[PDB]
């Protein structure tokens, strides 16, 4: 029943376009100047949108932005003359969301992450003193504005703490609001508890209430009744400085039991009085009151691109209104038109900053369709309005019993981000208030009603019901089998009779995410290794020829149709034209449909985004049939790895501690080979001496290194570039003909491949070049990488490894039919890591190879039998043995093990080993780095860090401690001075090494001198001294800086 997987990103932009921008335009529409003579009205319900310029593909290839222009009709009304100059004003450029849920910013694909925050409303908490009683406090939190904290003291006093200032009894706040004693006495249910506070703090009247409120809020100024009134109005009553939100109003009404309208979004007297009454009742234990949990998913909200955009637009609109008022009052003449009145710079700047430089808009993860899909379904607890890494602690990063079916309990990062970034579950969705829901089937008298439609439900809703998991087994029609059924009641796990079950989850995979739903035999794995496998499935690399798994899980065809790289025919007809770049299908009786395929493009992670056709010319095609496929799909469905022959046994030390031994067939059969495209850039700037020229007249170079340039100084498409090869030839006008200097762009060390695209952008051609540049040349270089020693290989069950040896196929162990293996894995890593599912898939994959079949096993498949996975695997293996005719395929004494021989000697190993077909993936990432001498830092004169600039390795203080414990003094002193920042000892050491002499003694490193200068610059007279040798002499200050 899986709906659109990337719908949290669409619904929020469809909402922004439909009723999100309108509400923010109308909320600021009536602009009036101070004299009250001119008024600008923004008829924001009629904002039209101009069609996007360029195109999606043109924007991508030009390195531009995919956006539209917003025009709102306005009317400037003169309060007296009455002349109304109606017009349409330009408001801004809005980047548009593509059909896949992403945005195209500066020619790069970006995605707006979803933020899990605390929902607006009122939250109660009870705190216990070291020796005192329980004291209760309440926090009122709006969508945007100031917080309102209430607190109960140990003596029975009620205090209010506006913002973070000092407390003030609630009587001041209630009287300042304009409430007499009778109304606040009647609304409260237990009035003597507040009467104690009234008596202790004295009954304030409205005038003195406002006086004291002003005095406490803004000390040092003379109190003024009007001053206080205005302070309160600006703090909690100003529609443009305090917003509860629709969700805030909903939560306030739901919690406090009020009935206020949904349109009012500011605090009202009723609200504060109710909140106080609830606090009093919670203090007195009335019965219908309860403290709040802040980690509950019923008290937490999700914000997506629509809300975050709305907020940025609001800020820009506030700035725009300030500019409009400034450029409206100054004018002494009504010669202004609405076009000349509005300035779209603040709004454009706000939108640009949000989409380019915010920490909620993120560079897309595009290694494969799975990473892309799970990047759009990601929920973050960090950002402008959430948490910070140093403030998030143990409680926040854990699993809350309310995450069941809404947030995956497996898929998270490892390290500082563990528990702070999560993934939406498979069936979960976000409603229009911002709370995550999840679907259930109704159960009537123990019968599951799959005829009726799924009932979605939020975390707070499903607390009074008894909800059964999706792995419960029902008989014909719908009745639940068994006598005891596990259920969840009030965030607890219990068991009940199946006549008292209220709801049942829709699927057994309703609790996990999409990446974790792609792991077969998941219930036989540990959760840590399941996390590892799910995370590593999103680092797999699209291969040269992808291949479907044999033991897939059933969600592969659905995890690939949302990335928008598979083409399916919407029409039940015939195919008339097939090409490497074009497909055409003629409807049985109708129009022709034509599709264009992307070819060897480049993703954010330098992988390849190819697209290939599947069908042939003159082929009968049905609707919904796969027509083209992506770089990580075979025929409809995800394909991230390959199926290879695997044996579980140790080699001669090459399997040691997660190392991997593979065969040479994986190299010459083009298994686990991939295409990676990199981008290099060169800039022609304008120096004070003169401009920079791209030409082949490069100094100090021979014609043997200008073979592949295009008589303009730029390499040619289709040329093979090795390391250090010139890509674009550039000359700079240095100041000291023989005057040009060479800073042409060359391939970095360790890079090679073919040149596939050389795009040029110059201001003449109508391109948006940087401020000081006069030519931007971009070169794309592609290469094919094979599996090799040092690469990371992985499986779906969390088993990672680094390849340490590649054996010729006559050295690898072979089967009783002569087939050498493809990979040998150490079994020592299986039982200590509890990822037994890898031993099931292999075996089933073995059967799948032998029976020319493909198995779709769904996780948690043991609801049908006592041991369903083992029985299915054994039955499949026996069936394969009977169909093939070879008895060595399957043995009854050792089911999963068969005899294997040694390729080096021809002798069989002592005992049979487990062999099968395993689905392994090749992970991304270019890490090898070395340095002798290179660039140095500006202040400290220490080597730079980074592979791209010949950087050094850091010798931290733990390494200094390690060298101190060894007793090493000369290695340490050489590391600290001669090899880092002894500005004069570096050259002497290098010269001594080159000449062959001895390295001289070092001096004082430059960082110490920098520190002494900084300390002197802090008004400290710190200095270095040389002690006097004889008696009647003074110590002499030593000059280091010489």
């Amino acid at each position: 029943h899986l709906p659109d997987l990337v719908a949290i990103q669409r619904n929020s932009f469809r909402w922004f376009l439909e009723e999100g921008l309108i509400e923010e335009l109308e909320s600021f529409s009536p602009i009036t100047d101070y004299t009250g003579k001119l008024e600008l009205h923004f008829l924001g319900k009629q904002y039209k949108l101009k069609r996007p310029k360029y195109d999606v593909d043109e924007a991508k290839r030009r390195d531009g932005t995919y956006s539209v222009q917003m025009y709102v009709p306005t009317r400037l009304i003169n309060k007296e003359t009455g002349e109304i100059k109606e017009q349409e004003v330009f408001i801004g450029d809005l980047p548009l969301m593509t059909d896949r849920g992403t945005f195209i910013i500066n020619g790069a694909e970006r995605v707006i992450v979803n933020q899990i925050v605390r929902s607006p409303g009122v939250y109660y908490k009870s705190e216990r003193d070291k020796n005192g009683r329980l004291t209760h406090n309440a926090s009122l939190i709006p969508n945007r504005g100031a917080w309102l904290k209430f607190e109960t003291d140990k003596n029975g006093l009620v205090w209010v703490r506006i913002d973070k200032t000092r407390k003030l009894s609630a009587q001041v706040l209630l009287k300042a609001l304009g409430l007499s004693d009778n109304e606040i006495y009647d609304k409260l249910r237990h009035p003597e508890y507040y009467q104690k506070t009234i008596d202790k703090e004295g009954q304030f009247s409205e005038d003195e209430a406002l006086m004291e409120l002003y005095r406490k809020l803004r000390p040092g100024e003379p109190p003024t009744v009007s001053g206080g009134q205005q302070l309160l109005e600006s703090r909690f009553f100003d529609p443009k400085r305090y917003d509860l939100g629709r969700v805030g109003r909903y939560k306030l009404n739901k919690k406090l039991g009020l009935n206020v309208a949904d349109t009012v979004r500011t605090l009202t007297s009723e609200d504060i009085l109710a909140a106080i009454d609830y606090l009093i009742n919670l203090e007195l234990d009335l019965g219908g009151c309860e403290v709040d949990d802040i980690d509950h998913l019923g008290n937490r909200r999700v914000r997506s691109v629509g809300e975050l955009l709305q907020n940025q637009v609001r800020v820009g609109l506030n700035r725009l209104e300030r500019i409009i008022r400034e450029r409206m009052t100054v004018s002494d003449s009504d010669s202004l038109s609405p076009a000349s009145l509005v300035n779209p710079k603040p709004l454009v700047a706000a939108i640009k900053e949000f989409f380019g430089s915010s920490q909620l808009s993120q560079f897309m993860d595009q290694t494969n369709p799975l990473a892309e899909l799970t990047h759009k379904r990601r929920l973050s607890a960090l950002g402008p309005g959430g948490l910070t890494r140093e403030r998030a602690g143990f409680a926040v990063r854990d699993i809350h019993p309310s995450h069941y079916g809404r947030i995956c309990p497996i898929e998270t990062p490892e390290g500082p981000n563990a528990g702070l970034i999560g993934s939406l579950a498979t069936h979960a969705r976000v409603n229009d208030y911002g709370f995550i829901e999840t679907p259930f089937w109704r159960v009537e008298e123990g019968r599951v009603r799959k005829d009726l439609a799924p009932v979605y439900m939020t975390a707070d809703q499903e607390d009074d019901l008894r909800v059964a998991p999706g792995d419960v087994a029902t008989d014909d029609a719908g009745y639940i089998l068994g006598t005891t059924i596990p259920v969840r009641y009030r965030q607890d796990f219990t068991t009940t009779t199946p006549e008292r079950v209220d709801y049942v989850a829709l699927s057994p995979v309703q609790i996990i995410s999409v990446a974790t739903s792609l792991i077969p035999f998941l219930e036989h794995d540990d959760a840590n290794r399941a996390l590892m496998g799910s995370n590593m499935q999103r680092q797999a690399v699209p291969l040269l020829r992808p291949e479907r798994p044999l033991v897939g899980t059933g969600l592969e065809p659905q995890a690939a149709r949302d990335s928008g790289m598979v083409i399916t025919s919407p029409v039940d007809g015939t195919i008339s034209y097939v090409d490497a770049t074009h497909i055409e299908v003629t409807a049985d009786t109708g129009e022709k449909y034509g599709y264009a395929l992307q070819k060897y493009q480049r993703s954010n992670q330098d992988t390849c985004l190819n697209q290939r056709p599947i069908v042939f010319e003159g082929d009968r095609v049905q609707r919904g049939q796969v027509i083209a496929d992506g770089s990580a799909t075979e025929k409809g469905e995800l394909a991230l790895g390959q199926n290879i022959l695997v044996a579980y046994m140790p080699w001669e030390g090459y399997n040691y501690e997660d190392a991997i031994l593979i065969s040479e067939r994986l190299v010459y059969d083009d298994v686990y080979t991939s295409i990676h495209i990199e981008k290099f850039e060169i800039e022609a700037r304008q120096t004070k001496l003169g401009p920079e020229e791209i030409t082949r007249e490069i100094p100090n170079v021979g014609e043997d290194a200008l073979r592949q340039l295009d008589e303009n100084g730029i390499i040619r498409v289709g040329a093979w570039v090795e390391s250090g090869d010139i890509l674009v030839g550039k000359v700079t006008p240095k100041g000291e003909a023989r005057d040009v200097r060479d800073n042409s762009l060359r391939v970095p060390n360790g890079e090679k491949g073919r040149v596939v695209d050389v795009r040029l952008f110059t201001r003449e051609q109508g391109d948006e070049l940087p401020p000081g540049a006069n030519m931007v040349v971009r070169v794309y270089v592609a290469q094919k990488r094979k599996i090799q020693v040092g690469d990371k290989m992985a499986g779906r069950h969390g088993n990672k490894g680094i390849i340490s040896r590649i054996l010729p196929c006559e050295d690898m162990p072979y089967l009783p039919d002569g087939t050498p293996l493809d990979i040998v894995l150490n079994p020592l890593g299986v039982p200590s890591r509890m990822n037994v599912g890898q031993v099931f898939e292999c075996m089933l994959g073995w059967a799948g190879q032998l029976l020319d079949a493909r198995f779709k096993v769904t996780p948690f498949d043991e609801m049908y039998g006592a041991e369903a996975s083992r029985l299915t695997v054994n039955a499949k293996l026996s069936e394969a043995r009977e169909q093939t005719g070879q008895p060595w395929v399957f043995s009854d004494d050792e089911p999963g093990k068969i005899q294997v021989y040694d390729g080096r000697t021809g002798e069989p190993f002592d005992r049979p080993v487990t062999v099968g077909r395993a689905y392994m993936l090749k992970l991304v990432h270019d890490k090898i780095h070395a340095r002798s001498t290179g660039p140095y830092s500006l202040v400290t004169q220490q080597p730079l860090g980074g592979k791209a600039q010949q950087g050094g390795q850091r010798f931290g203080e733990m390494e200094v401690w390690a060298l101190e414990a060894y007793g090493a003094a000369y290695i340490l002193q050489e590391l600290l001075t001669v090899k880092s920042d002894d500005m004069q000892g570096r050259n002497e050491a290098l010269n001594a090494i080159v000449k062959g002499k001895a390295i001289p003694r070092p001096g004082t490193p430059e960082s110490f001198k920098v520190l002494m200068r900084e300390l002197q610059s802090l008004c400290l007279d710190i200095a270095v001294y040389k002690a006097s040798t004889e008696d009647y002499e003074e110590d002499k200050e030593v000059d280091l800086m010489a």
Binding site: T933, Y936, G946
Partner: peptide, 17 residues
Amino acid sequence: SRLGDFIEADGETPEDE
């Protein structure tokens, strides 16, 4: 990560002396 840690220094590379 800061911008100031990605800028090289003016001087003669030990190699070029």
